Symmetry: D2
Subunit: 472 residues, 4 copies
């Protein structure tokens, strides 16, 4: 048995109690991570508070050098990290190695982007002539101790997208890796520690949501909460964070609005790739197709073909559809499928289940009464909703309680721009699948899909405070 | 007996139950504002949600034209608005007219600044080569409905600072005027309605807090809370908002760090002019003087002289020290003064209380144990703190619960910059009093002084969502 | 016998000699302007140099107040300015009044844009760790005396697009109104003097290009040359300026690339409006149609139908084509037409001339051998050029020695956005005619079509110097 | 006898004739560089024009990768290029190694800077309601072929400061290394070719100035000229470029204004370090001390001690003062010293010459009538000027014909910031010496000291053209 331990104040620490992690594919005992106690979690935050000053007292280029060394150590260990990440969140082996290398690239970009944050030198005289001799120098300072909470679906990539923009800002961070995927967060901590980052600048917390989960969020040293997860927990984090600054990125039901003049082969390929990447267990995925009744039949057949050519197996065979993360989620997916299937929705793809591994289901003839039309599954299920006009498509898309992303497949671009401006959403992709995209691109969700704006530049900006120095 | 009404959906409505306003000067009946209910608040919110699309659909220059007309009408009626404001919050008559003028300037600037917001057009090829043919046209969109809960100390200026940056961005607003100062907010609504602002884009909500307060501040149709007020109430609003965006401007106890190499005459003038303005009832006022023991005696002498030159009396006599707004607040300042007196603090100025009319009190020899050294009085009392080192001064300043603004009074700007970067505060004024400043300057409070960055450009960017459209530049 | 004067040092001065101005439509005496001599130009430069400091030492808000007063006076005299402008450069009355209104709006926008020029505060610690405690406050200061040389096409709009963006920056302006249109530049000067702009801040120089034309461009007091005109004079004064900053706005041969999936009725209307507005005498006009071979016949029919509805007459009837500015230009345009006609190009519209008044001529079947395919006519002539593929269209468009603008008419925007990147122009309009456009938008020409970037923000930026004030914050 | 070759299409060519390079230290043989003819320059131009589309096409990550590899190879061969550079320009050996390291750092910063270049996305709503639905995507495009010609001062660093910004912007470059320092530029080209930079995107041109040069500047294929050198040559290049964009960095007398309250001990050290780094042969070195008469004697004594500490000798052994670049410059500096010595200026340090090696000379009592007070010596001598007031100091500093940089040694930053706004320079260092600085900081000269803004971001923005793709959104 491999026993992993938390990085606290530059040191490795085990707790009295431990948590054992099991593969979502084999249920094989994968390792063990410590289960910390409220007191051991205070010690970690006191270490962070004590390491804050000497760390934000460095120049940006030195801590950027630390980040670059971490990225190099990550990239040389891509297979070692990737195989256990694949084992732990049931991800394809090429996909896991891919996110490790994409994480290294994200860390490099964040290091060189937080290294160029310039301020302002505002003047006074265009507002009043009595304040004409007052220059204000508006620079930007770290918020302090940033607590990053990572999702299971990307334990290395979303955690790093939280860590690195904080660290380059002069900002001490504490990571809480998810319960399923804590080994990956601890391997990221291993890379950070081997890079030589000072003691207390990067710390990890592992435990059970019952003991230290809400305690670390409501702590006084914590200055910024950066959370990725689902809306039930995001609502709590928003309510009990207080007046304190937060960044939440919760779920979404991204719609693929397909119109009359649309390249339906391109639309079908892009929709299936987006919808069934990582079994649909990703927040930025197409989770409903809203297509006009004129082209809906051609689109349905094309989608059926694309979904049929998807391989459904083991992660290490690089299957397209690997088993979902646990049995509770598979039960939720099966409930959504049963509700849709008993309400007379034609299933264009076979519906079958072997434990966690459940087959991609493509539903057609979906109405407003089936729950698969409204709820985010995180499973390989894709409803097809048929509407009469583009106005009904806009109304149906905007009737969701979520608003991350959308796709507006069409051929007229003034029409796509009109539709994109009418969609209550954060990002509109025209003629493409929804992505978190190049990570310089902004990433946000509106309505109940999040709070704050992600992306490297905006993440670096958000975990900082502006300070004006006003003189004559 | 004047009965004011609420601007709801472009029409003046009144409720069957009304609140009476009494001037803090004479306790004279000053008017009567509606005290409306849950359902009337629902109707106003529905009117705004219906008024969005036709107002979001307007171009920026048309929305700016409405705001320019509002500012012209506000400059037209300086004396009427100013007299009613002076009566209602016990503010000097010359400073009430000045607040109306500053409000008109603020909303002109907000209109011309919000019609000038540019998006980004970033590319993917600098991040990775597989995204080289990808353009994100990232622009800005309204949040929707904005609550603009305003404070008593500036009912016209600090409500327009929330309204104008919201309306120019494409938002529609609910204004909740303060309990004491509601008539001033309704007069600002008069100006807005007379400007021809479309129906439902500006709405006002007056009522008893325990009825239409937490209700409106947690409605599902509210998209942004913009609140100025007290730190406890700000805590509750950050709680009740949820994951909705908020701007909170809360209290602050601004420090005036005075060092040895400091021009003590200028420091004394700035400190008194900052501390005893509107009887200490601002949030960016000097509230602590932290001075090195080397120069503390000369500083105290100059401070005492200039506090003594201050005028106490009637607002219509343009007195520097007008009555405070409540009996409860007057009792709060009295309790702080009593705690300082009982604990052997050297009062350098007479302590008097003729009703609401507290007297400007300059306390010296203030220690860490008195409450006046740690609590925001919103009254004309100014403690003097003595420290033996600049590090000790920085530690004492950073022990505060508030982080709004601070002054460093010195002659060496290199060390002034050092101290300024060491102060846990939002703005540092070097050799000058703290102030909300040229409203184009950023205005924030770290710690328990608030959440969000204010200032005209910053407020326009705050009440606005990011929308990016990503497509292939093939 | 109306006599106009030059605004120099806040006062009006006439010279010994004069230039008589004749209407391009009636040849009737329109007035006289002074023919300044070199020493008078020196005195205007000296007045400007003496007025620069106190103008620089104002607030942006005060200079903006001056600019706003000028814009109000301009909009007050719409018809008085517009009638004379139409008489002097043969614009339509509606066109001339619209020009004056557009200049008023441009001055207001430039005023409100010059108030919001923010500098940056740069740190050295990102570049190297030895410079971490070193901060650069990089702001922007006026270049000094800007000389604006205006065109005849827009003698009020393309003169205020140089003066207003400079006066807001703190720069003093010397205006050289065009030879035809000099009355208009002195009528704009009257608005600036009635506004009350300080003495020396705005001065005018009307003379002969032989006596005071390279003398003013080669003066030592001039710190920025802002010129709009034709490419030969632009080449001359670009070489003639030396190291001094210049902004050249020269000619263009804007192409309308029309593709097979284009909406040909929209394309035809857009092309005709752009090509024959002000009878082709704009720099930013469609000067050639590069239509693809498949849709060329249908596009030519639609183009012929819409060129046949254009009213050819006099200004005061608001005709579409009015007489060209002078006889030399009519002769040059006639030479281009004759060359095209003898080269066997089919003329789709009648070819007729009545003095300066040329009828719009639409040429089809134009090859690269005809001079109308390459040379800019500044008159009512539009060649139609047929190509086999979009590669040949792009090659033919890029074979010109002028950049400036282009219009790609198509229905696939990922194709228009790909052709736009291959076009060697400053601005590509997609499914619309070329235009200087919202004056907030960038306006630039590449190749031989200009130097520098205009647009209100970029004009304000370019006529300023960068000043960095690096110090230590240790 | 090493034979060096020019890089063109990724291949090394040599010409028939060649120029021999002699070290300024001992007139020793360093090698020969090609002396190409005008036809070979045409072939290099054509190679770059052919390489441009494929370099423009590939993404910014890929160009940045090439630049990063060049920087790594420069780090690898510090010692080789360092020793060759020290022999070639009589640079101190540690100074030469340091220049190569700083060059690699500049390459890396420019590559990472070029990825972040983001465009605007403008709307027309706030200028006009008519064009509310119009959106302009304003991005940035390379000029084409950039011609960078380097100085002898820093033939590796001031070469790279032109190569890297242009070449990350998407431009292809060809470098004309100095006559004395060509071997160092060819070693830079060696690093670029070894990194695997594509063929034709980086070319090198060496030869006699009277043959290829001037022809090189006047070529039709050159789109940008980036020159650093002397003011007389830069003025010729400004005339000879025409309307094409240029960026010129020329000489300067960086004044050191020392005031009453200045920390004289710190000012003396800063002044001597700045004035005598590389024995006076920098453009941004302080070449002139303006000091108030009351503190002038103490400042002069401190300056004398600091100058006496300086070591004179051989570049190996790391002498502070090393032989000047050639004998013509040694004669020019000696003529300036003779003129100063003639008119009763008291030298505080021995005047002494050993052919090419000059001793540092600290002159006092320098007046307006001596040439050393107004001519740039590019040699180890600085004058001290006595003034009676701050206004007199500012007037004397602004009588110069050069802008560039200047230092104000004081203790009141509010006074220094006021003197900085009145000094006609590009950058003003408060209480520190003039320097090109963290290369992220803006570097500009304002009057006869140059044209354009350098600095890494500013040089990237200068090498590029604006492009708009205005289209309709509704």
């Amino acid at each position: 048995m491999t026993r992993y331990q938390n990085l606290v104040n530059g040191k490795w620490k085990s707790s009295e109690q431990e948590i054992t992690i099991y593969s979502p594919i084999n249920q094989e005992e994968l390792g063990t991570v410590p289960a910390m106690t409220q007191t051991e979690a205070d010690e970690a935050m006191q270490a962070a508070r004590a390491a804050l000053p000497a760390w934000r007292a460095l120049s940006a280029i030195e801590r950027a050098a630390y980040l670059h060394k971490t990225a190099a150590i990550l990239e040389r260990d891509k297979e070692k990290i990737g195989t256990i990440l694949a084992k732990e969140v049931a991800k394809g082996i090429k996909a896991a190695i891919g996110e490790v290398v994409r994480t290294a690239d994200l860390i490099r970009y964040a290091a060189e982007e937080g290294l160029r944050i310039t301020g302002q030198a505002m003047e006074g005289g265009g507002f009043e002539a009595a304040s004409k001799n007052k220059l204000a120098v508006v620079r930007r300072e770290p918020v302090g101790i940033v607590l990053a909470i990572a999702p299971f679906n990307y334990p290395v990539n979303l955690s790093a997208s939280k860590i690195a923009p904080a660290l380059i800002a002069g900002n001490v961070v504490m990571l809480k890796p998810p319960t399923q995927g804590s080994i990956s967060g601890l391997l990221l901590a291993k890379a950070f520690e081997e890079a030589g980052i000072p003691a207390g600048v990067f710390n990890t917390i592992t435990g059970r949501g019952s003991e230290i989960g809400d305690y670390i969020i409501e702590h006084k040293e914590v200055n910024f909460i950066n959370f990725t997860g689902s809306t039930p927990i995001g609502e709590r984090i928003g309510r009990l964070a207080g007046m304190r600054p937060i960044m939440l990125e919760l779920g979404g039901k991204d719609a693929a609005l397909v119109l009359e003049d649309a390249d339906l082969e391109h639309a079908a390929k892009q929709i299936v790739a987006g919808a069934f990447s990582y079994s649909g267990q990703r927040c930025t995925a197409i989770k409903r197709v809203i297509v006009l009744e004129s082209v809906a039949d051609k689109l349905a057949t094309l989608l059926q073909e694309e979904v049929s050519k998807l391989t459904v197996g083991d992660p290490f065979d690089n299957a397209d559809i690997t088993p979902v993360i646990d049995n509770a989620s598979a039960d939720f997916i099966w409930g959504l499928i049963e509700d849709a299937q008993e309400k007379e929705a034609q299933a264009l793809t076979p519906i079958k289940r072997e434990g966690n591994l459940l087959w991609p289901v493509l539903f057609d003839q979906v109405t407003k009464d089936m729950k698969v039309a409204w709820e985010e599954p995180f499973g390989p299920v894709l409803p097809i909703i048929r509407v009469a006009s583009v106005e009904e498509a806009i109304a149906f898309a905007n009737e969701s309680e979520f608003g991350l992303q959308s796709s507006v497949f069409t051929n007229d671009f003034k029409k796509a721009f009109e539709i994109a401006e009418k969609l209550e959403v954060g990002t509109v992709h025209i003629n493409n699948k929804t992505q978190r995209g190049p990570d310089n691109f902004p990433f946000l969700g509106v309505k109940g899909s999040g709070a704050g704006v992600q992306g490297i530049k905006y993440s670096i900006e958000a975990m900082t405070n502006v300070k004006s120095i006003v003189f004559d």
